[PDB]
Subunit: 345 residues, 5 copies
């Protein structure tokens, strides 16, 4: 029979000389560790901090020949997660953690099973707040590439090597969605081998190609800033010569743009370059700034003979018949050159 | 007599070979674990994060025949919560925790009693910050369905199965209320069995049908945005022909709507679809945007013969006698089609 | 002599069979635990969360006859707080903790002394963030009743009963004050016995009758909203007939009320009922909304014969001589009915 | 020789009967503990919470005759900070901690040396978030007195007494500065002996006299509120009789004061009394509120004979020649009485 | 052979008398500890708190002759990071931590190797939130010098001395960048030896010369405040004599500057001195405040004979022909003196 109480201690403890402080295949080749991650929760992709919180099941597989068993009849032993403090485990860390933690609610969220030949499957639940540097040039239409790279902190490349396994290195939960992005399906899997003045260390990362749902920004930034571009066109059809209302209408619209432009970047890092939403909020700040300046020409020109008196006002109304149509052709010639530049990535 | 000092150690320790690393009924059927939760505190249902904090008493019951006792005369042993580190306990976890913790103030908030036949009751106090993806299409009248699902992380479906017990799987505190929602009474109880590339794992979740108290939004969003819809009607009865006040009144009301519309979504996630409060705050942004545009017609028309001079102004006042009544019929024909669409779920 | 080194171990350890896993008077009556709390720090009474942080010295007293000593000559043993992990201690918890923690700076902040007859005094320092549901109907003049109830999580009512002691169950620090409230002196002390499907459990709570310092709100909400009620009275004495200023003055005052009304509830939960500060900020939103509407009558009436021309304007100035005095009598007849309703609780 | 390996264990362990659970001089006089603190970091003096974070080196000295050594030749033993779990240590705590923690980065930040006669020096690094109730009557010119008091939680006054040592009880880091305050040099050192219903307990506190750098408030509150007091003087020199601009200029300035007054207390607790910055922001709210009201007199008076027509307007311009100079004498007679009241503490 | 299981215990444990509580070279010279840091993550350089979060690999090297081995054939032993609790380690701490923590995700992020002669390499991953006092005189063009100094808390200068090693004391990650600053390449390395009343303690710090990316501030503060400086120039070309629009245009521009000036310092500490962005936001607050005051002269002068009537208005238009060009020469003579003062550091 060989009950399971004795078999457990006969594999880890003083008998058989298992020493969890000494890696497998000592004084031999490296310990080929194949990895893959399941993603439960993805999101909270902040940009004030330029990080993102993920929740994964880190699986790992290596081969420890000291963990070989033939006395037992079946082909696997999913064991107590309290066993994990007794076997060797690779010292994987996330080279851009910025804060990570296990989960220990009602039990350690850990798994451990050991095939007959000695293979190990070590799945643990982790929450990471990974650091990815956002490139925000073409901001509302950007395609971020946030990474997560799994280094080794203490074993060099000739003692512990990581790998992704061939059959589906990165799964995703069945209905996993994001509030603002959409995780594209192709997930890169490339090496990131590290060299320090201590030596070289195994590294393997997995690129995630995020992508913004532009829909939210077509409802708060673009449309609400395309109306005020139209109110600045209201300052033309009124009285045809002059009034304090045109200056009033002009001054107010320039007020909203200044306030609305500031609120546009209210929740972004203070990057030192001009991003895509800036030139929009800058061009719409001209066509409002031009109307209030356009009136300054006519009212100045109007307050400036026997027969030239009638033609004198034609010097002004000839403007308002051009400005009233010159603007809505330039804003539409710009607005088509804009979206073709960013929808062409 | 058999005092309780000796009886405790005679059930757990080296005698009798209890091994807390090996589940009950080893090499046999699964371990049928029946669960139910008491809910002390429910609330803080955030939406910037799309999660909610709960505070529950997780009860559990299974059957461990090794914990059977006949030497003792009474029918239960509510034991020391320090005992829990010595018996088998299922590795239940909350598949969408997003952060959970026990409570250990003045003692571990844990319970443990063991009937004669071997049944176990294991009640622990937990605080969870569970993740539920909010569907915010019809926002102020939405009916969220936030879940909480109790998986098993290390034992497969042929070694540990969960269940809800038939008699009241989900109680609630006696006077439990919510600040913004109302927890409906019917609580779904369905299976959520999981398949990974490690195997299959037992899962059972409990749907909670939340529902917004719409009263708060009929005091800050709808009513305060129904007044400014009326001030935009003030721009009609004044002077009957033209004045800088009508442009002034019109410009200001459009200012409030833009600011108030932005503040409407000041505390929501940046979802990429149009929600119910948006089309209201958009339609009320037209009827203000139309009045300021409506004046642009009359003032343009007025500043445009022997007998046609009197009828010429009738070309304008015929407008203001229609606009002054055409608007308050369209806003009321829309406002009835709106609330019938959302009160019909 | 019997030095204190040997006497300590002779009371707890293997000798005498003290078993901290087994309550006093086993198989007998319950363990009458008398409690009382000293309050160091009270405050941070939030309402976005509807909780409050307290800092207390929880004292407890029971009787453990196994802790009786006659070899020692003196009448008390204030002992090492490291002793507390060795004696029985009731598993008191705070049924609405929402987060609590001990203090362990320079030592565990714990006390322990043991009279000769076996009494125990167990004082520990705790920080609690207790949950009290705020009732905010009459908001700036409300009288909250936040509680704190001390249940037992694992022992049923026939094995552990709590009580408040008769001589001053709830002290308070000598000069303890609050930033916004004033802790009234009478502190209720009533039972809160709990019944679950596990059994019944001892409970005893202590009501604290908070009460708002209304002074802060008579400086930011009421007075700053009583001036703008007066500026809306400025729109009467100017020009006696009409001007764009009256519409200008009216429009601006309605702007401030809308903005100021929103800021009034800027730091409150989104309760689904109308609170006391709302009807004030609503009534003051009418008397501003009426002036801007009051001008719409006169200016409409004025722009509407041989002898009736002079009496025609009297149709308007008869208004402004009434509105200029009708308002400051209604606002004062309302303002007296308001404060009598809320100062009468 | 007597190497240091054996000498350490010969002082703490089973030999010599050192019992860290029993204070020095048992059954004798109290244990005179002399204290002093070095202050590394001081600041983050919040007022929404009314607390302040400090970072100190708590030194302590007492006399434990059991720690006397003559076998060793030198006059001190700066020992391993892992030793501290083995000797007696007074249970000092900070009676207004509100949250404190050790530092354990690269080692416990702890010190321990033991002179020959038995003296002990026990220096530990601590971060405290101490609670000091702010008195904000004369707010921008206030002089806070935040304290920190070092009580004993478990030993009564006849078993453990604290003291400050005579030679410099409170040092400060060499270039320690504060962002908003300036820590005055005199630091009070007085007793705070406590009496509870458990007994009396040793206490000694150290007052810190903070003091605000008023410079920041002479750049955002006072100067920016002294300009708008001047724009309200702009409403006099324009047109000498009346215009919609004066009402426009008046209405806008009253707008800024209301908004700016609210922003003045944007980051303060909701205290129930009138603070110094309030009467300034209230008096400047009158001189703007008076100009807009001052125009209401003239414009009302102007729109009210054969020879009295010319003198009739003199009834108005006599005002504007007084108001244009009466104001800038009252604002300067108030502004001198103000600063003499608060610069005289 | 001498397998690695026995060799490990033969170096640390009871054999050979290694005592981790006693430094190397006891009763001899100090323990020369050479340090260097690798910087993974740098950033979150806050200023409300005046701190910055870093993420480093602290390496250390000393010489412990008790850790000498000749039985083993190879020249290094990268060992289990669980070994670190058994060897001597210097008690380095960061004298301005303000909060630090190790990383323990999937293993302690620690390294340990031991050359044959006894050298030790001890690399650990750390996250620090270091305190650097910001000097914000010339704010958007400032050059901060944030430090990090590595003291010894318990060993005096005659028992433990730190040093930087000569070959590259401070590396940086390969593509490390910052959101707002740029870490200059020269990194100072100077001593900071400390003297307390406990003795003297080894200290060595490393200055980091940060430097602001001024680009962000040329897009939100300077340019958006250079437009409104131009709108205040719009108040000249309109009507050449007077209008309510000029007062309207003037009043509004002064509004934006006041609001925009406040928002300029919306995210900075309340420093008690005038910083560089203040005099810009103050000078631009004059040229707007002068235009609204400039109109007060002309409109006052205009409303003030047979032949002097025509020359009387020339007394006013002579102004507007000077003010319309006097301003854009002073703003450009100031604007060149400004940037030469701050680009000259
Ligand atoms: C872990 O994975 C590595 C790489 O996949 C394995 O290294 C490879 O080991 C094989 C033998 O097992 C080597 O083949 C031998 O190479 C020599 C040249 O040195 C050549 O004469 C023959 O082809 C011979 O078979 C192979 O070179 C070597 N490759 C590398 C890149 O190291 C390693 O064996 C794996 N270890 C375990 C425990 O699985
Ligand atoms: C835990 O619960 C499961 C499901 O309720 C139990 O499994 C059931 O066990 C019974 C016997 O105890 C099985 O009945 C037997 O089924 C065979 C077909 O395999 C049929 O010839 C007879 O009806 C026979 O009685 C039943 O099939 C089986 N059902 C399932 C779905 O597994 C299990 O016994 C419970 N274990 C414990 C320890 O309570
Ligand atoms: C803890 O407190 C409870 C309640 O104060 C005590 O219970 C009381 O115990 C007394 C005896 O000690 C009981 O008196 C006896 O009652 C019977 C009826 O059952 C009657 O024939 C006599 O009056 C007799 O003296 C009393 O009934 C009982 N009351 C309750 C409510 O339980 C308990 O003894 C205390 N235990 C300790 C260890 O202090
Ligand atoms: C700790 O400090 C306290 C106070 O500084 C010390 O108490 C003092 O102890 C001395 C003797 O060591 C006492 O002197 C004796 O007083 C009696 C009156 O009771 C009088 O007849 C003589 O003057 C005699 O010398 C002194 O009164 C006493 N004072 C107080 C306030 O307690 C204590 O000895 C110190 N303990 C240690 C271990 O240093
Ligand atoms: C740790 O580093 C310090 C400083 O680099 C070393 O101290 C130096 O030790 C050498 C001998 O090893 C001393 O040389 C001797 O100095 C005497 C004067 O006292 C002079 O007669 C000779 O030049 C003699 O060689 C040197 O003075 C001394 N310097 C200092 C500043 O202490 C120390 O030896 C190093 N310890 C280890 C374990 O590496």
């Amino acid at each position: 029979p060989m009950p399971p109480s004795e078999f457990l201690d006969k594999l880890m403890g003083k008998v058989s000389g298992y020493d969890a402080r000494i890696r497998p295949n000592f004084k031999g080749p490296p310990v080929n560790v194949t990895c893959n991650i399941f993603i439960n929760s993805f999101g909270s992709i902040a940009e004030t901090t330029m990080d993102y919180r993920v929740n994964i099941f880190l699986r790992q597989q290596w081969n420890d020949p000291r963990l070989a068993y033939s006395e037992y009849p079946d082909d696997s032993l999913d064991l107590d997660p309290s066993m994990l403090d007794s076997i060797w485990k690779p010292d994987l860390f996330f080279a851009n953690e910025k804060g990570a933690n296990f989960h220990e609610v009602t039990t350690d969220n850990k798994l451990l099973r050991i095939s007959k030949n000695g293979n190990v499957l070590y799945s643990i639940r982790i929450t990471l707040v990974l650091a990815c540097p956002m490139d925000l040039k073409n901001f509302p239409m950007d395609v971020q590439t946030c990474i997560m790279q799994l280094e080794s902190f203490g074993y060099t490349m000739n003692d512990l090597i990581f790998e992704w396994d061939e059959k589906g290195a990165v799964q995703v939960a069945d209905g996993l969605t994001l509030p603002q992005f959409i995780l594209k399906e192709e997930k890169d899997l490339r090496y990131c081998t590290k060299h320090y003045n201590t030596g070289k260390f195994t590294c393997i990362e997995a690129r995630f190609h995020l992508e913004r749902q532009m829909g939210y920004y077509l409802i708060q930034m673009y449309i609400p800033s395309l109306l005020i571009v139209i109110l600045s066109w209201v300052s033309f059809w009124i009285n045809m010569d002059a009034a304090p209302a045109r200056v009033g209408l002009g001054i107010t619209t320039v007020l909203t743009m200044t306030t609305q432009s500031s609120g546009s970047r209210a929740s972004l890092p203070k990057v030192s370059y001009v991003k895509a939403i800036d030139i929009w909020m800058a061009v719409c700040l001209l066509f409002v700034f031009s109307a209030l300046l356009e009136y300054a020409a006519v009212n100045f020109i109007a307050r400036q003979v026997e027969e030239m008196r009638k033609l004198f006002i034609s010097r002004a109304k000839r403007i308002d018949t051009v400005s009233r149509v010159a603007f809505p052709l330039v804003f539409l010639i710009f607005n088509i050159f804009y979206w073709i530049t960013y929808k062409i990535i």
